[model samples]
Target chain A: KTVVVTTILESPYVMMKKNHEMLEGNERYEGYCVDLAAEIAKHCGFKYKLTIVGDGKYGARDADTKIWNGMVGELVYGKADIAIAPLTITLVREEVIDFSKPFMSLGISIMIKKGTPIESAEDLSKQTEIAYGTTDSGSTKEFFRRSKIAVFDKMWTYMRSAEPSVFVRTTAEGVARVRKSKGKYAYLLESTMNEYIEQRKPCDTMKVGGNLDSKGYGIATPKGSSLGNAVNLAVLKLNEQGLLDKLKNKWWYDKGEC
Target chain B: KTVVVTTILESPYVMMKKNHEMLEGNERYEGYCVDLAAEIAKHCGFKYKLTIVGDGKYGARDADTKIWNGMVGELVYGKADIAIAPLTITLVREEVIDFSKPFMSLGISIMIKKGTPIESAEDLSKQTEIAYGTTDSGSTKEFFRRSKIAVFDKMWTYMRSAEPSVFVRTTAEGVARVRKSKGKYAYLLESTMNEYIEQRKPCDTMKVGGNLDSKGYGIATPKGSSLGNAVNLAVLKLNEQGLLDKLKNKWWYDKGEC
Candidate 1:
């Protein structure tokens, strides 16, 4: 049976190649995770079909339904044989799914207009001069929701009740908001995306402050699936074997503007 | 049954709380990991005995005996209930023992005397003016040994055959060598330690260049041990919950001289 690979349309991770409508099959997409998907199959020795997740989420189980959603749901529901993207590895997610060892490390970080007054989350939390928020239904928002620390806790309080609903549904929207807000709005996101955008066009934004938490993205699979073990080893070996770093340089810096 | 926790005396992770001879049991040690052990037990509701690994190394399986050594050894041989140290999450080690999601993120990085001309791995690899090396029997060395990249492979070749053996037994020895070498010798070490030393007493050494890899330090436990599941969850929660960052600030920067 041919494997179905599920991924999201996140920038620099998995993006439709130019004139994607004219392309077919795997050639239609190219990015960091796209390359990783091909490399994983080559090392693990398998043939797979790549497809985007219908809902376009990394995965967050809804409390009301107890039904998993996003790429994780794809795996739990057997919609995708494997997931190769920037999905984070967390305890709640780990309870219902299997994740290989981390393939890329990231943390919840601050993204600000290039000349914003904020140097730390504490800085943003201390003042109302600048509004701050994170993407909804992902680890960054979950981090603020789950934090017990005083500063983050206080900021969460303000964000939850902000009149304008300072939340975004996607990373692109947050970046867009930052560029137009003229330093009035700061975005909280993964350092990976924040770094990528800082080197990208418009070049009007910068990643500031230290990361709030430390974690990594893993190749997520379903519970008790045999694929998790082999992919785990492959991620570790290929990482140690140097493919991971090189790919990072290729996609992140080789094409960088600054 | 009291849990047996095996760790090392590495600075800011586990340290002989000054006048350690006057104290006993857990009181004799204090540092980032020491504080973490207390937090884990409190949250998990378990009593554990903290002890140092007999071999004093972080565990690399010996090809000759097929026996694992160091903190990993203690857990593999049932001499310890868990390990809460700076043990890195790697492939070979993961095969023998279980690791929690990483509690701290780190990578192979370059350490140099203040004001060195080097700014990247490629710079070091391309020049023979200054000699550089990593500690023996560990992931940093293993990374260079395993790298197939032309630049890293080249450095590894020169290092393996270099005079006086660029390899050292511990991070401390490497730092000492770097301090006295007057910028002629560079040390390849983890970003965690590199950053720590940059703020330490001598302060003449500094961390420079982008990391060559992405990985993190995890709390290690024996495979199939019931402790693995609960501890893994606790680690994930504690790190995301904020104690990890607080402890890092307390140990690495709060006490920093420079």
Candidate 2:
């Protein structure tokens, strides 16, 4: 049986090429996760087809409706066999689906335009002069919303009630806002994406301070799927064999302009 | 021959026990490094004797005199077989002696009074309201002095010319200043020491922001010592067995007051 891999298009992870219009199927896109899916299938002894999620979102639950959306929704509804994107493994998500042992570790980080003067989350939280927000419908947003730590909770209060909406619909939108905000706005996202962008041209943005919290991304399969165990083992084996690190270096750094 | 281990009398790393008057030899002192030395010696099948370094300094080169002092000097001049204090492994020192893979990882951290307005190194570096300083003749001070990073270099310039000397001769002195300055002073030091102090009585000080840089403490030996191979392997084994973590918990948190 062919595994249907669900993923999202996030730069350096899953992205369409400049020549994508001339290509077909999986050949039209390439990135860290695209390569990762191939490796997982090879090790697990399965054929797979790559399918992008219909909606452009990482995943989140609807408040009043109790429905999951984005790639997570596809996994929950059996529309896809596996998810191989930068899908974070959260307790809420784990209740609905099974995630393999984390294939990549990352943490929420602050991204700022060069010379922005912001140094840490506390610095951003205490001031109104500089605004900050996280990508909507993702773990970074959920982290701030549910944090129990005093500082984080305080920041959440500010973010949830700010006069102007602080949240962005996507990582690319957040990055663009940071670049154009003239040092007035800072975007909080996963460290992997932040670092990847910092190395790209027009290197005017930097990841300041350290990560706010620790988390990891994993391959997702619906709950009770027999392939969960096999996929998990494959991730562990690839991790031990250093294939994940090699792929990360290949996609994130080898072509880095900065 | 019993290996002569040279260490220092630093709080929590090596301290004269309250009952030292009634004890003899290695039994006279007990602390984190004391226990660490015992573990390493046991793993490497060696009998060892502990002796304090003649100079209490952590170790640095005297600019004009070109001479080493403290535990590092003891190892370099063949005055001792090994040095096992909270000795930092630095590039300059690596030129003369060998260090085992880091037995303890640490980084430069900021210590602030409970209600200080400063949240990060940048905050402190930008304002003159809360004066900041590092322990004199230590890696923390050296880091700021030699850092090429823009914010760090700016801080170094401010610290070098601050009207009142910000450098303290000891960690105890720096902590005392932070406690008594009424939110007007901040201290910079290793994260391990800062976290240790934050958990102590009074609890009026806290470590703010992430570490400024990454480095670690390692077991040191003379450049060509035969013990290097055994000591390095022992450290790796202890780390792999979780013994190192167990020892840290035993010393730092098991009896924590705050």
Candidate 3:
């Protein structure tokens, strides 16, 4: 009866416990995302085991190879019943799967060195002096690359054809790139993750500009899953109980910002 | 310019027509139950007059009498702006009322002759053995009193207690008596109306089993009124646009059963 759940390592949301190496799959899983999964399982009357995505990729369909990766692939191919990660919901993914009510609300935000010249997301559209990129294969990057709005549309124009690489493999890499490159590189990611990172050690990066669009991180399952109703209701119940707010405060407030 | 709005002759849809010989002052004004008056006025950009409310009585609180009448007075008190007629959103009325969209949808059904022994909302429900009634106040009565459902909750019930002897002054009068009569009298009403009535209709006339509930109607306004947006796009638009269908339909289709 144990539902197999897949997740990824995203700082401040999901990360390997310091003692993960000595733990079993169920015990090895622990984080804000893990806690949410546990709550859903408890409410839904299901026993579950959480496992990390073996591959580091955020489950993108390779255009050339025609293959899938990460937690997304697990669900798409029937290897997993559910996925709880800092995964972004995208139109493409939506076509192949279903998502529960958002467990967290956030929008895409831009990260730049505290004193860098960039002031807002709008500013990113005007310059090639500094390069901006997003975590590959997620809503944040897809938003800039596919928006109909002027600012994002224009930003996409530059990033798609930028001389240097303009997308990172993961949010972690995006953050690392911004930190190591000083003010030369900027990362675009969800406000929740960006804010969490802003308060962490080194604290050299700051989120700038208002959110580009509104979105929520949702629990994902394969299309037509019977679990959809229960999962959606469970999330709403948790939201009504204010459990979500308490969890966010526990992580974002109790621990330092991301 | 004045907005040319369409309204029904239902109890509360419109309190009084500007030209009605019996109406005086803002007693002619209408309210929220008036339907699309406020919505169309806002969306289409027009000012208009409230001239509906046929018999005016869908469960209202009579201050002097200390009893509930049809909802007509709510409109007479200047609370509404338009009246969406027997406004069922069927193909018939959609052509009129500038009905921005249906606020609700339902199916037609019957109120049959009791003792004559009709079984469901379909055929046996309508027969010669019983006489059905419709509220002199609204379309609901017309639908069922004229329909084939056994014991149309309309005329049979209304006629029993209409203050002047079951001659009902409004939809409220007729509905109130349904409970007092038991199955011997039976009342005919809309499925939604019937369901609502069942919730609080009266104890005597049971809704029996099976009903046509999808018949939908909307709140309307004078052809044009400032209040149009308040009800049209804000309220009925969702139902018209399918969002409401997504929410309400799922409930009725999945869980609503005899």
Candidate 4:
């Protein structure tokens, strides 16, 4: 049986080729994860098909409904055999799913429009004039919500009660909000994305400050998946081979538009 | 039945307290691992007896005899129920044993004389004047032995053939070679050990340059261990609760003399 690989269509990681209208099946999707997914399949000796998640979200469990959504939900519900995406390895998520040893351990950072005066998170927390927040339903928000650190606690408190609501629905919206706010806003995102975005035009943004914490992105599968251990070792071998770095440069910077 | 906890009595991690001769059983020893062993048992809700391994090695598999040695072997042979030492997580060992996610992910680094001029692995591999090698049996040596990275491959080859036998039998021997040899020797060891050694009296050694690569120390049990998952989650929770950092400082640097 062919494995059904679930992934998101995010730039530099996974993206539709510009000529996708003229292509179909695996050929239509292209980027880092696409290449990674191909390599993972070869290493595991499996035939697979790549299918974007129906909702284009990184599944978070719904509180009232007790349901899961996004690519995470797809794996849990057995709609996909594995998920190859920028899924953060978090405690809550790992309960029902398994993650390979991380191929990449990036960190959370601030993405602010160029020339923003905020050089430190301390600066963002001390004032209300410049607004900042993270993805509404991601591990970023979870970190802020659960964090007890002084700066983080106050930020979460302020974010929960902010005017017009500060939590973003998606990374795209978060980026757009920062670009449009013209230095009035900052978004907390994985530094990889922030760096990738900074390199692309209209080039009006930059990542600032040291990473708040070191976290990792891993290839995911449902809990106790038969493929889990094999996939985990495959990722470790690839990393030991330095293929992960090559792929990162090939996708994130090699195609730099600016 | 009480669980058997196998550990090592090495420096600041596990040590014989000054009054140990008057103590008995579990009270006979003290240090970071002693405290950690207690906490792990409490978290897992079990009673345990701490026993120092007969063979003080970290437990590597013997290729000829198909036998395992050290703390790892104790767990593998059912002589010990768990291991809470500075055991490294490696693929070969992982096949016969299971490990909790790392509580410490320090890197392999150089331990050198106070006046040593080398600053990189490139320098070590490029010169024969300053002999460098890791423990005769350790994940560090395993790393260099298996690494295809140019610098590492060369260092491993030179170390294997060094006339005076650069490979040391233990971390202590490695450190002593550096201390006694003046500037003629550098010990390749874990950054954790190097930093700890640097802080002790007769503190004439210094750690230099970036680590060759990131590796980790994990709690270990035999393969398919019943307590594996709980211990893994316990470690993750302790880290999330910030206890890991507290323990690290308490054990590594709080006692620093310089």
Give the winner by lDDT.
1
Docking outcome class, model 4? acceptable
Candidate 3 scores an fnat of 0.00
User: Where does candidate 4 stray beyond 4 Å?
Assistant: A17-24, A195-204, A240-258, B22-28, B112-119, B176-184, B198-209
lDDT of each: 0.88, 0.85, 0.61, 0.85
Candidate 4 structure lDDT: 0.85
Give per-residue lDDT, candidate 2, residue A10: 93
Model 2 ranges off by over 4 Å = A1-258
Q: In terms of lDDT, which candidate is stronger, 1 or 4?
A: 1
Interface RMSD of each: 1.4, 15.0, 15.8, 2.2
Task: Give residue B251's lDDT in candidate 2 (0 to 100).
Answer: 79
> What's the C-alpha lDDT at position B100 in model 3?
31
Per-candidate DockQ values are 0.65, 0.02, 0.02, 0.29
Best by DockQ: 1
Write the residue-wise lDDT of candidate 1 on B1-258 in tens digits: 798899998887999977989998999999999999999998889998899888788998889989988999998898898999999988888988998878888888999999889999999988878989999867789888878889989999999989878888888889998998889899999999999999988779888878888787888888889887788889878877777888899999999998
TM-score of 4: 0.88
List of clashing residue pairs for candidate 4:
A59-A69
lDDT of 1 by residue, A1-258 (tens): 777999988889999998999999999999999999999998888899899989877787777998888898999998988999999988888888888888888888999988899999899899887999988777777778878889999999989988687999888889999999989999999999999999998788999988887888999888888887788888988887778888888999999986
How accurate locally is residue A2 in candidate 1, as Cα lDDT from 0 to 100? Answer: 77
Model 1 native-contact share: 0.67
Error of 4 at B105 (Å): 1.4
Q: Give residue B117's error in model 1 in angstroms.
A: 2.3
